[PDB]
Structure 1
Amino acid sequence: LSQFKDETNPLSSLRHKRRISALGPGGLTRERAGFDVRDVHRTHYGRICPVETPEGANIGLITSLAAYARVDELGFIRTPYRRVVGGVVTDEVVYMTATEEDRYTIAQANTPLEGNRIAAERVVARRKGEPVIVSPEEVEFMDVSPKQVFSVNTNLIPFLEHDDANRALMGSNMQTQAVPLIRAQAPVVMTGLEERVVRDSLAALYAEEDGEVAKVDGNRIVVRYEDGRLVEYPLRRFYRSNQGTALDQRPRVVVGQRVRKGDLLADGPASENGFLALGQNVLVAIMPFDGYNFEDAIVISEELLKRDFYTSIHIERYEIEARDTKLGPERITRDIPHLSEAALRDLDEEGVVRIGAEVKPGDILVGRTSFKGESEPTPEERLLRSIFGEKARDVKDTSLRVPPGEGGIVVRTVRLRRGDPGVELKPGVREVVRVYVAQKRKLQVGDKLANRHGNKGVVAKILPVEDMPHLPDGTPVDVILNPLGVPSRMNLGQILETHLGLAGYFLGQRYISPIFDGAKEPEIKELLAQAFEVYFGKRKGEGFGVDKREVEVLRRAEKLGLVTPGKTPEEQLKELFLQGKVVLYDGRTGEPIEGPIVVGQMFIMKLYHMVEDKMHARSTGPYSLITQQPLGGKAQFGGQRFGEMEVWALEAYGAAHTLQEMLTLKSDDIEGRNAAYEAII
């Protein structure tokens, strides 16, 4: 029940603290009570999120506490309902348990109000779980807000009501895995929560009283409060989360700035002005692209890379122990025995790598020498040495090296010694050394991107801007999402997000569109109309008519019955823009794409990359002492697991030798694997 705090980003932690397990000292996985327990109960309404849950074999066992829900002293989850008396609705709110609730006829929140008065003839209500239509006389309580039904994470999904649940689960989960970018943006279309989350997550640093800013540098902020108090705020800087992602507060405030109580001072890792910023807003055209977006895969304009758009900073920690031995002590030292000097360059510092060095895989982080092999040199090596001015030293190179698959650049080394400072070291250890290595991970093929509507994919292609589909005004797009990822998923929320986002892109505005409340088709279409004026309205003023290609497209467009026949070229184009579709030019050919394409701004997150899911390759390495099977080293990968399932596939192929060599030469058979190597060499 105690676990490694998930702090990939602020929300990860918030969500982690709000979790609810059925496992531990209560009945778990063995018993699995399938389809029971794992199951959203009528009473979960407003107490537990019906969507936020782990996909996979923990489904419905671990679970998330709903936004407004509260746990009382007896340990029961309660939910706020406002008391309604005779069709008028009081602001007097009550926190009912599950059993108290069952005594009542509770109306839904969208129920039309005319002031405090219930305006509607018939009212939707739940009577102990039962959806019913009732007249307003019969109503005893009302929901506070759609917000209450869902977890925090889910509440962050705009247009949620348009997404099937299975995919909104994936949405509210992936947000957890969103890595903090260095140019993070809060979404164009928000729900509400995004500000208040950062507040509670303790991500960003706020001012506790009215005052004026005294000092500000990347390192600390000092504030003179109206009483005279000068309080200093150390700005936690470039620090390492459990997950290796960085957290660092940056100052968002200038010297001599007047500041109200509760005003912002520093942004967290994943906030943009105190609004949760978990990703970028980015232009997306939804259309297939030559197969590069084939099966959830995503294409990417190199332009993103240049704008440092999906760039995150990651810090890895390395440790090395200097241990006492039965053979005698070993030491951290610059003086290792070998055939190199250019292999010591950025070390000098008495064993340890210099703070600021670029370290590649295989390079020396910390130099270390152990007394080795029960201290016998080979009679065969004894000679070899005396031919070269023998030393035949007792101590071995056990130096710490940057493992394959990369390191980066050194930022802090930390040294702890022989108990004496205030340190309890593992028994047998003389001292440890830590080296911390930072890397600006740019976006690249393989990286996985996600929107909040559970559309998730892997960057399969990076095209040069010239190849990118562009609007007529010469603006190219950033990502190309495939439409086939929508019909079967029934996550229509992203399409709406895009439409509003398109209007936003031209009107230079962002939106708050509450869950089960928010923007609605006609309101978006009105904004798209305004936007059209910017996107097109000016073209005539700057001296341009409609493109011959624009005409070509409309001809085809009216046969699809998107546009009205007879209406002018321009007014057809508006009609099309109201459906959130534009005319797109193919940057390869210059010709247009037959029929209009939906483009617009979408919020997308780059997702945390786990070491287990990093790229792996073994040739030949260590082996297990007892079983003599390939085993993973420090800077040497273990082998892949070959299971009976894979053994059947091979059998069904009749690939007899392959199966054999898989389970002998390439594993178990001892001399087999040596003779094999020697042979190949």
Structure 2
Amino acid sequence: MEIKRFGRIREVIPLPPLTEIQVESYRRALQADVPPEKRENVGIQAAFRETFPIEEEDKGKGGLVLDFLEYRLGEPPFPQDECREKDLTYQAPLYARLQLIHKDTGLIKEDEVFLGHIPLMTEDGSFIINGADRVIVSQIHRSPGVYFTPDPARPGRYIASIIPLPKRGPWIDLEVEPNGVVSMKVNKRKFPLVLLLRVLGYDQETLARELGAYGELVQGLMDESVFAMRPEEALIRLFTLLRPGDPPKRDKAVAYVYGLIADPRRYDLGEAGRYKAEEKLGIRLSGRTLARFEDGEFKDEVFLPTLRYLFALTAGVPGHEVDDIDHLGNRRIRTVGELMTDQFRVGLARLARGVRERMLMGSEDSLTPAKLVNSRPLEAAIREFFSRSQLSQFKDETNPLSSLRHKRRISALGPGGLTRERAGFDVRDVHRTHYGRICPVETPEGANIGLITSLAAYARVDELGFIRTPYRRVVGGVVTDEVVYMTATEEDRYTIAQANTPLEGNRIAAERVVARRKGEPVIVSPEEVEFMDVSPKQVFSVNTNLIPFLEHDDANRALMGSNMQTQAVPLIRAQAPVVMTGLEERVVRDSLAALYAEEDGEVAKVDGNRIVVRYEDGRLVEYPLRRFYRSNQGTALDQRPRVVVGQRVRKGDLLADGPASENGFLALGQNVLVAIMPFDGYNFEDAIVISEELLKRDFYTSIHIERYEIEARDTKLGPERITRDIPHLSEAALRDLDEEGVVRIGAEVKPGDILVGRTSFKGESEPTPEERLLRSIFGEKARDVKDTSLRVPPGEGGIVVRTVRLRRGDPGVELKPGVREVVRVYVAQKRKLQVGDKLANRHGNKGVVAKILPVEDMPHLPDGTPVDVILNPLGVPSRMNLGQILETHLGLAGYFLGQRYISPIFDGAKEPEIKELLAQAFEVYFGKRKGEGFGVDKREVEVLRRAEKLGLVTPGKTPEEQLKELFLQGKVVLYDGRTGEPIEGPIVVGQMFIMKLYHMVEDKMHARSTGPYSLITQQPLGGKAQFGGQRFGEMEVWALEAYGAAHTLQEMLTLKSDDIEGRNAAYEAIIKGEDVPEPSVPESFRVLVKELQALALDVQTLDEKDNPVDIFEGLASK
């Protein structure tokens, strides 16, 4: 299986480690491996230092000075798998170091306080929370900076805006009124900005001349000079305009917060907020926000340049200073680390809220730790984040790729409340900046469009929540092997060129060059080229980047394909596509699917269970294998070993294959032999037909493991117990249970079988007065006990593979209150490809398997080789996805050559390469035929007739050469299986990669007769051996109503659910062989009479002539 690779653009730098977003976000979050000595703070340590100097001074007695030194974690409670087996979180313990001082002598320092537990991250990038693997998405929002907006309402001029956040961080808006009045909005407050400038220290003289020289608009500033004659008098003047009945003397009081400390700051000193100000305007920014503590009289870092630029924009050209919202340099991405640290900060301040109150009830000296510290608020906060937050979710780990794509997903809809389901128009739209930064394809179908979108393959978040796509500098017309990851805003400064631009080492070729100055598509010259694209993968996500002939595919069905790959199911006979993009290897690599040698070496031992190697440095290492493990959405993820005893190996070489990996290539489905023709109505509107042969050679067959669980809760009536001797059960039903009442391993279990025997006592509680005595009187413990066991639900199981008991004397387990033990039984099934299943190619051909033909009567080549699958051609013209056709063609050639290929995305394989390879193949599919003893079939001739008459072959030629022609065009003769006559027209066939999706027909087919019914509302449900009924919706009612279906509708609203007396009459009467007892009165009606009567309404029923009518069945009488 030799790989030819097509197209050579030398993609100069490899992909980022595609998990880096989570791993490094949660590295930067918690400086954990590094000493607290280490100089950078941001994340946990900064969230610490932010709150930490806790000054509760003088309202009676104080001198509390509790400060921060160090913090540490080190030791996780339990192993990872231990954290999953028992339902525990994978965490480290947090204890920071502290010293509270006094107004008097000395300072007690209690080293450690394990205030709160803090989860950890796995190598691969996920978390373990409730026992359950979870993942934190990222988030988008408006980056905290200085922005300039056209006046929404008024058509003319602009309004500034100073945006901070964390939420606590005040919002200021600086608009200039044609009236001249420079208005200024905080908390809905509108006033001449000047009052504020004065508070800073700006006198009306230096202001107008040195700022507003260039605009005459400066005269809109200086109007109220009457008030602006007095400095600190202004601070009070302003103090007025918040009016709770304040102390008008309290000087630096509100101005303290919007100066320095708690409110507008960005994370840390240097680049946190300063970049967004520094770039859009201004020059520098000492301090986090405009502030002063050392002199008391205040300095604005900010307020002058902001207004200066509102001038600079209102009048003429510094550059062109209107700011775009959706531009991804004026929008920001929230890594995991930061999100968790935001919650960690608000938790820490819940603690700082309680401890102030402990500064009051505190004795005098006796305070050192637990007086001040409880884990409770911080713990509750972090825990609340990880297990209840909108942005944590169950790991999408159907297959490796799925989980990977989840890890690098990106959401708009913030649990902080960033965006809501109502609005979406311009929000959802792709924006110029999403180039190289965000996938234009990866957004999902239906409501969630453009809100959740995954980031580009090459994109990577820098120190501050900004996406940065690379580019390579080019020098005059000389291209560099040097690469710069550029900011969105920074990107627009330059003239960037396309990667599909011709080369000669470092040199452009074409005088006409394709290139993009900010946004626009521009034709340009070689000299003018400042930067060039790295490769065309950078434009799209990872999924989207695994489609090989994407170039020829409408983005709409390309999205379908990208998303489809998410839901592929890992197949026992998994295969890596005959034709790949090349990323498959790196994807199984970066996902932690497989197992790779760490050094050169040799192999020592190879179990199904583990592998042991002997390295160069002297080491010998055991790697155990994930033998057969269950995944969040059912799919089996075992690792298989691929190496032998006494085989040498190379660093980075693979040792065992992941869930859906084939010799270390992403294997999501198979390569089947497709013919692409219509069939006797069996591949209709998208349906798909199959050769039974796929089942005999276990192809589209996948394992699946469900997992059942039951508790032995403890009761008012007495404790429940897990045992074999249930009462009213036939010996037959008990055969497969072990002595403890748990079903034994490797037994075949049918819906209705017992998995776990459990016996509860008779309910209605322990009747002390008479029975208590009876207990003494008669064989104490001779009471009564009913059976409440665990049955395989309708739906099914298969065979028991694994049991887990979590018993009392709980040896490392957090059992719920009341819970005595729990039992889980794991049940697997091999799921062959039944009819009703879903299959789809990479190019987005959703289809159902609709017919399984026996090998015998389905379309076969001249040589008796039949096709495996039969796709309707009618699926192609609508859904412009000619990629799959080119897959099929290349596949055809790869079948006879016995080789696989890599067509890089936009550096594809071109038409004639294809053709040459096909020629190569014809001399194998046919060259043999002639020597073997066999020329043409009379059928072959008879179809070549119609072929040249149709214009496919060129008349006058030998059938050999005609068949060559017909081959190269993608098509070959095909015989009907069932007639043996040929198909009157040649037909394209080839190898197609096609996969089996999560949507099998187990989760899907229900059918209710009769059963349970809910207690308040009497519409049915299910439990023991009964499904639940389908909802008959209002529209379904409308449907019936349009028709005359009066009775059918009544039934649907009566006998078939709700009306009890009626439905019972109905069943019994069916058993008789009677029609059905519809009438009497409807439930709803008598119930709405009495329910109406419960408020004092007299609702009475009348005859034709207005007369009384007893609706209540002769039961109304007193």
Which range, TM-score by smaller chain? over 0.9
Structure 1 residues 565 and 543 mapped into 2: Cα distance closer, same or farther (>3 Å)? same
State the identity as a percent.
100
Structure 1 residues 381 and 119 mapped into 2: Cα distance closer, same or farther (>3 Å)? farther
Checking the alignment, whether the CA contact within 8 Å between 1:246 and 1:269 is kept in structure 2 is yes
**Structure 2 counterpart of 1:544:** 934
Residues 239-271 of structure 1: CA distance to partner in whole angstroms, max 9, x if unpaired? 011111011111100011101111110001111
Checking the alignment, whether the CA contact within 8 Å between 1:377 and 1:392 is kept in structure 2 is no
Are positions 1:626 and 2:1016 aligned together?
yes
Checking the alignment, whether the CA contact within 8 Å between 1:556 and 1:595 is kept in structure 2 is yes
Checking the alignment, whether the CA contact within 8 Å between 1:585 and 1:592 is kept in structure 2 is yes
C-alpha deviation, 1:88, in angstroms: 1.1
Residues 129-179 of structure 1: CA distance to partner in whole angstroms, max 9, x if unpaired? 100110111111000010000000000001000000000000000101000
Checking the alignment, whether the CA contact within 8 Å between 1:401 and 1:635 is kept in structure 2 is no
C-alpha deviation, 1:393, in angstroms: 7.5
C-alpha deviation, 1:634, in angstroms: 5.8
Task: Work out which of the residue numbers 552, 558, 561 in structure 1 matches 2:951.
Answer: 561
**Aligned counterparts of 1:566 and 1:382: Cα–Cα separation in 2:** 107
After alignment, is 402-411 or 624-633 more displaced?
624-633
- Structure 1 residue ranges without an equivalent (≥5): none
**Aligned counterparts of 1:650 and 1:612: Cα–Cα separation in 2:** 30
**Structure 2 counterpart of 1:140:** 530
Residues 10-39 of structure 1: CA distance to partner in whole angstroms, max 9, x if unpaired? 000100000001112355664532221111
After alignment, is 621-630 or 528-537 more displaced?
621-630
**Aligned counterparts of 1:640 and 1:222: Cα–Cα separation in 2:** 54
Checking the alignment, whether the CA contact within 8 Å between 1:375 and 1:394 is kept in structure 2 is no
Checking the alignment, whether the CA contact within 8 Å between 1:419 and 1:425 is kept in structure 2 is no
**Aligned counterparts of 2:907 and 2:772: Cα–Cα separation in 1:** 82
Structure 1 residues 228 and 385 mapped into 2: Cα distance closer, same or farther (>3 Å)? closer
The 3-state SS of whatever aligns with 1:499 is helix
The 3-state SS of whatever aligns with 1:236 is coil
**Structure 2 counterpart of 1:414:** 804
Structure 1 residues 294 and 31 mapped into 2: Cα distance closer, same or farther (>3 Å)? closer
C-alpha deviation, 1:121, in angstroms: 1.8
**Aligned counterparts of 2:582 and 2:646: Cα–Cα separation in 1:** 31
Structure 1 residues 678 and 392 mapped into 2: Cα distance closer, same or farther (>3 Å)? farther
Task: Work out which of the residue numbers 93, 101, 126 in structure 1 matches 2:483.
Answer: 93
After alignment, is 21-30 or 206-215 more displaced?
21-30
After alignment, is 388-397 or 137-146 more displaced?
388-397
**Aligned counterparts of 2:769 and 2:886: Cα–Cα separation in 1:** 77
C-alpha deviation, 1:86, in angstroms: 1.2
The 3-state SS of whatever aligns with 1:138 is coil
Checking the alignment, whether the CA contact within 8 Å between 2:1054 and 2:1062 is kept in structure 1 is yes
**Aligned counterparts of 2:776 and 2:715: Cα–Cα separation in 1:** 28
Are positions 1:129 and 2:484 aligned together?
no
C-alpha deviation, 1:276, in angstroms: 0.5
The 3-state SS of whatever aligns with 1:52 is coil
Structure 1 residues 352 and 283 mapped into 2: Cα distance closer, same or farther (>3 Å)? same
Checking the alignment, whether the CA contact within 8 Å between 2:835 and 2:851 is kept in structure 1 is yes
Residues 278-300 of structure 1: CA distance to partner in whole angstroms, max 9, x if unpaired? 11001000000101100111000
**Aligned counterparts of 1:376 and 1:562: Cα–Cα separation in 2:** 89
C-alpha deviation, 1:559, in angstroms: 1.0
**Aligned counterparts of 1:510 and 1:383: Cα–Cα separation in 2:** 83
Structure 1 residues 530 and 456 mapped into 2: Cα distance closer, same or farther (>3 Å)? same
Paired residues for 1:193-342 under 5 Å: 193-342=583-732
The 3-state SS of whatever aligns with 1:3 is strand
C-alpha deviation, 1:418, in angstroms: 2.4
Checking the alignment, whether the CA contact within 8 Å between 1:208 and 1:262 is kept in structure 2 is yes
C-alpha deviation, 1:501, in angstroms: 0.2
**Aligned counterparts of 1:339 and 1:400: Cα–Cα separation in 2:** 13
Checking the alignment, whether the CA contact within 8 Å between 1:382 and 1:392 is kept in structure 2 is no
**Aligned counterparts of 2:465 and 2:926: Cα–Cα separation in 1:** 59
Checking the alignment, whether the CA contact within 8 Å between 1:171 and 1:454 is kept in structure 2 is yes
The 3-state SS of whatever aligns with 1:68 is coil
The 3-state SS of whatever aligns with 2:393 is coil
Structure 1 residues 387 and 55 mapped into 2: Cα distance closer, same or farther (>3 Å)? farther
**Aligned counterparts of 2:778 and 2:1053: Cα–Cα separation in 1:** 43
The 3-state SS of whatever aligns with 1:540 is helix
Are positions 1:119 and 2:524 aligned together?
no
Checking the alignment, whether the CA contact within 8 Å between 1:280 and 1:309 is kept in structure 2 is yes
Taking only aligned residues, the RMSD between alpha carbons, in angstroms, comes to 3.3
Structure 1 residues 414 and 637 mapped into 2: Cα distance closer, same or farther (>3 Å)? same
**Aligned counterparts of 2:743 and 2:514: Cα–Cα separation in 1:** 69
Structure 1 residues 379 and 586 mapped into 2: Cα distance closer, same or farther (>3 Å)? farther
**Aligned counterparts of 1:230 and 1:341: Cα–Cα separation in 2:** 53
**Aligned counterparts of 1:501 and 1:382: Cα–Cα separation in 2:** 80
Structure 1 residues 147 and 184 mapped into 2: Cα distance closer, same or farther (>3 Å)? same
After alignment, is 542-551 or 394-403 more displaced?
394-403
Residues 612-660 of structure 1: CA distance to partner in whole angstroms, max 9, x if unpaired? 9421122222222222222343653222111111110010012011111
The 3-state SS of whatever aligns with 2:705 is strand
**Aligned counterparts of 1:522 and 1:196: Cα–Cα separation in 2:** 29
Structure 1 residues 385 and 172 mapped into 2: Cα distance closer, same or farther (>3 Å)? farther
C-alpha deviation, 1:372, in angstroms: 3.3
Are positions 1:680 and 2:1070 aligned together?
yes
Checking the alignment, whether the CA contact within 8 Å between 2:837 and 2:1000 is kept in structure 1 is no
C-alpha deviation, 1:406, in angstroms: 1.9
C-alpha deviation, 1:594, in angstroms: 0.4
Checking the alignment, whether the CA contact within 8 Å between 2:413 and 2:420 is kept in structure 1 is no
The 3-state SS of whatever aligns with 2:602 is strand
Structure 1 residues 499 and 610 mapped into 2: Cα distance closer, same or farther (>3 Å)? closer
Checking the alignment, whether the CA contact within 8 Å between 1:54 and 1:62 is kept in structure 2 is yes
**Structure 1 counterpart of 2:470:** 80
The 3-state SS of whatever aligns with 1:284 is strand
C-alpha deviation, 1:434, in angstroms: 0.6
Checking the alignment, whether the CA contact within 8 Å between 2:412 and 2:419 is kept in structure 1 is no
C-alpha deviation, 1:337, in angstroms: 1.9
The 3-state SS of whatever aligns with 2:923 is helix
**Aligned counterparts of 1:635 and 1:198: Cα–Cα separation in 2:** 42
Structure 1 residues 179 and 637 mapped into 2: Cα distance closer, same or farther (>3 Å)? same
Structure 1 residues 224 and 439 mapped into 2: Cα distance closer, same or farther (>3 Å)? same
**Aligned counterparts of 1:118 and 1:186: Cα–Cα separation in 2:** 37
C-alpha deviation, 1:376, in angstroms: 11
Bigger relative CO (Cα 8 Å, ≥ 6 apart): 1
Say which structure is richer in strand: 1
Residues 50-80 of structure 1: CA distance to partner in whole angstroms, max 9, x if unpaired? 0011111001111111100001111010000
After alignment, is 339-348 or 595-604 more displaced?
339-348
C-alpha deviation, 1:392, in angstroms: 11
**Structure 2 counterpart of 1:603:** 993
After alignment, is 79-88 or 665-674 more displaced?
665-674
**Aligned counterparts of 1:529 and 1:611: Cα–Cα separation in 2:** 42
The 3-state SS of whatever aligns with 1:99 is helix
**Aligned counterparts of 2:764 and 2:525: Cα–Cα separation in 1:** 90
TM-score where L is the length of structure 2: 0.59
**Aligned counterparts of 1:533 and 1:435: Cα–Cα separation in 2:** 57
Checking the alignment, whether the CA contact within 8 Å between 1:583 and 1:593 is kept in structure 2 is yes
Residues 175-219 of structure 1: CA distance to partner in whole angstroms, max 9, x if unpaired? 010000011010000001000000000000001111110111100
Structure 1 residues 402 and 379 mapped into 2: Cα distance closer, same or farther (>3 Å)? farther
Residues 521-553 of structure 1: CA distance to partner in whole angstroms, max 9, x if unpaired? 111001000000000011111010000000000
- Structure 2 residue ranges without an equivalent (≥5): 1-390, 1072-1118
Checking the alignment, whether the CA contact within 8 Å between 1:333 and 1:350 is kept in structure 2 is yes
**Aligned counterparts of 1:387 and 1:604: Cα–Cα separation in 2:** 73
C-alpha deviation, 1:380, in angstroms: 22
Structure 1 residues 573 and 387 mapped into 2: Cα distance closer, same or farther (>3 Å)? farther
Checking the alignment, whether the CA contact within 8 Å between 1:212 and 1:259 is kept in structure 2 is yes
Structure 1 residues 381 and 572 mapped into 2: Cα distance closer, same or farther (>3 Å)? farther
**Structure 2 counterpart of 1:46:** 436
Larger Rg: 2
Structure 1 residues 386 and 567 mapped into 2: Cα distance closer, same or farther (>3 Å)? farther
Are positions 1:475 and 2:865 aligned together?
yes
Structure 1 residues 65 and 383 mapped into 2: Cα distance closer, same or farther (>3 Å)? same
Structure 1 residues 189 and 365 mapped into 2: Cα distance closer, same or farther (>3 Å)? same
Checking the alignment, whether the CA contact within 8 Å between 2:762 and 2:784 is kept in structure 1 is yes
**Aligned counterparts of 2:760 and 2:398: Cα–Cα separation in 1:** 37
Checking the alignment, whether the CA contact within 8 Å between 2:838 and 2:1000 is kept in structure 1 is no
Residues 72-109 of structure 1: CA distance to partner in whole angstroms, max 9, x if unpaired? 11101000000011111001111111101111111110
**Aligned counterparts of 1:337 and 1:576: Cα–Cα separation in 2:** 74
**Structure 2 counterpart of 1:520:** 910
Checking the alignment, whether the CA contact within 8 Å between 1:285 and 1:600 is kept in structure 2 is yes
The 3-state SS of whatever aligns with 2:499 is coil
**Aligned counterparts of 1:386 and 1:306: Cα–Cα separation in 2:** 67
